[PDB]
Design a protein around this nucleic acid. Structure first.
Ligand code: NA
Ligand code: NA
Ligand code: NA
Ligand code: NA
Lengths: 166, 166
DNA sequence: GTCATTGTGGATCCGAG
DNA sequence: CGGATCCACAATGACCT
């Protein structure tokens, strides 16, 4: 089981306004989870233009510390550019896999943003209702679909993928 | 017809103690020739350990200029590291070909001494008894074998081989 | 001195919100 | 920011006796 994680933030230095995950088990996506989160700092307008989470949407929400333990319980955490989520999140109990590194290694010279990959790989995942690109749970479904594609294409195991991730 | 030339010397600066040649015609080695030569300087102990030619062996022999015209009569002069032989010999009336440059171009990262190439390429020619490796005529057979093998592998013409050489 | 191989500083572009 | 990826180069060595 691989747990795909995504985090929307106040900006590139961090502060968490949303987190979400799905699990990939036997080529299927299951066990969706998301929380809006009260950040440790103001949301920047540049970040707010991307994820469209306003201060009022998160004003009364739990802190990241309060919410992060619900995401414990996996050996493998997967993120698109996992470097980023690993930095901005509290320490996680597992090992990280980066689908960005994987994509670049599997298709040399491919464009390697999350949505560019999804578009070029012609993926089709059923996304959850009432969300959009750059809402955490939505992007989890994109990245999970990407990870499933990577695994079928390559035949890489969780271990090989962690090794490639470095 | 290509003429393989080898020289034994007093050391890396020159001084000629032996010269030898064979011709390669239609993939056959013919017309062996060799002269012991009186050098224009002392034979270094380092050189003597390689070729085993002594002062007493060369004391009454002709100078290199006396002997060198016997090796006229070819359009092509082949040597392994031809730069060396060209530097230490008087001027020759043809174009030079280096089997060492050719081998490195053909088989990069291979060890590229005369006898390493001969071994790695699994070559076998009739060699002349009475001599040993590092006598001039002996090493001529080794180099001629290498040349023939370079020619079959590569399909390069004499002119092309001379162009690669410089 | 040539040349395949090894190494490096630097410039540049990239992902993540 | 934390990385890749080229790129313009220098250094290494073998090679020849
Ligand atoms: Na993300
Ligand atoms: Na996202
Ligand atoms: Na020689
Ligand atoms: Na020799």
């Amino acid at each position: 089981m691989l747990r795909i994680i995504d985090t929307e933030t106040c900006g590139l230095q961090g502060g968490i306004v949303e987190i979400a995950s799905v699990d990939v088990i036997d080529g299927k996506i299951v066990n969706p989870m998301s929380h809006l989160v009260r950040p440790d700092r103001p949301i920047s307008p540049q970040a707010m233009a991307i994820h469209r989470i306003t201060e009022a949407m998160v004003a009364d929400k739990p802190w990241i510390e309060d919410v992060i333990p619900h995401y414990y319980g996996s050996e493998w955490y997967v993120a698109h550019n996992a470097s980023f989520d690993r930095r901005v999140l509290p320490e996680m109990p597992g090992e990280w896999i980066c689908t960005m590194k994987l994509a670049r290694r599997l298709w040399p010279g491919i464009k390697y943003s999350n949505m560019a990959l999804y578009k070029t790989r012609k993926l089709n995942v059923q996304t959850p209702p009432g969300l959009h690109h750059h809402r955490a749970l939505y992007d989890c479904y994109i990245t999970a679909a990407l990870l499933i594609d990577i695994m079928n294409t390559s035949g890489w195991t969780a271990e090989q993928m962690a090794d490639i991730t470095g």
